[PDB]
């Protein structure tokens, strides 16, 4: 419909598989909307150069734990999957 077309128009059109956009944030833990694809205890990278580990996979939201300062993160930043469980270079 024309209504449906206008609905597509007013939407951001990200299906949020493998990316989320952060909701309310602070206290060094974040609640993200989306991240439909997301492994448990994965490392996610926020668009602010700070990464966090998903702890609570909850219906509709995922609760990342921010490995980094609050000042860096603001609401509605785009969270991309690092795609890997928390790993550290070894050698």
């Amino acid at each position: 419909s024309i209504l449906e077309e206008r609905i597509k128009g007013v939407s951001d059109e990200a299906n949020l598989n493998e990316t989320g956009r952060v909701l309310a944030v602070g206290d060094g833990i974040a609640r993200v909307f989306g991240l439909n694809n997301i492994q448990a205890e994965e490392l996610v990278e926020f668009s602010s150069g700070v990464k966090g580990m998903a702890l609570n996979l909850e219906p509709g939201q995922v609760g990342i734990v921010l490995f980094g300062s609050d000042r860096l993160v603001k609401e509605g930043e785009l969270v991309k999957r690092t795609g890997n469980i928390v790993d550290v270079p070894v050698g």
């Binding site: 909701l23 309310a24 944030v25 602070g26 206290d27 609050d70 000042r71 993160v73 603001k74 609401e75």
Partner: protein, 113 residues
Amino acid sequence: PITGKVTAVIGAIVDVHFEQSELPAILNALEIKTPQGKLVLEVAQHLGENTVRTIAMDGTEGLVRGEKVLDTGGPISVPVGRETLGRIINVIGEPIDERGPIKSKLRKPIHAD
């Protein structure tokens, strides 16, 4: 600049609702023009829906839920310089020594890594 209307004043924890998509970042400094003078609120959370949770640096008495807030844009920026030597400055970085408006070079954010 971003402006917002006060949407709670439970204790000295004042929640301010800011324009759509445009909300101060965490640790920013907000100034609410008050009959008192000014009230400085510091953003310490984002409560979602472009609302924040702030703490106050001045008394919150007589606030009306709806009062305009102005966003400085970052942690309180306090004057620095050899001018500031021997001057009593209160929390909002303003003279309380009453030796007049402190002539300043630079001002700098209070939170610094």
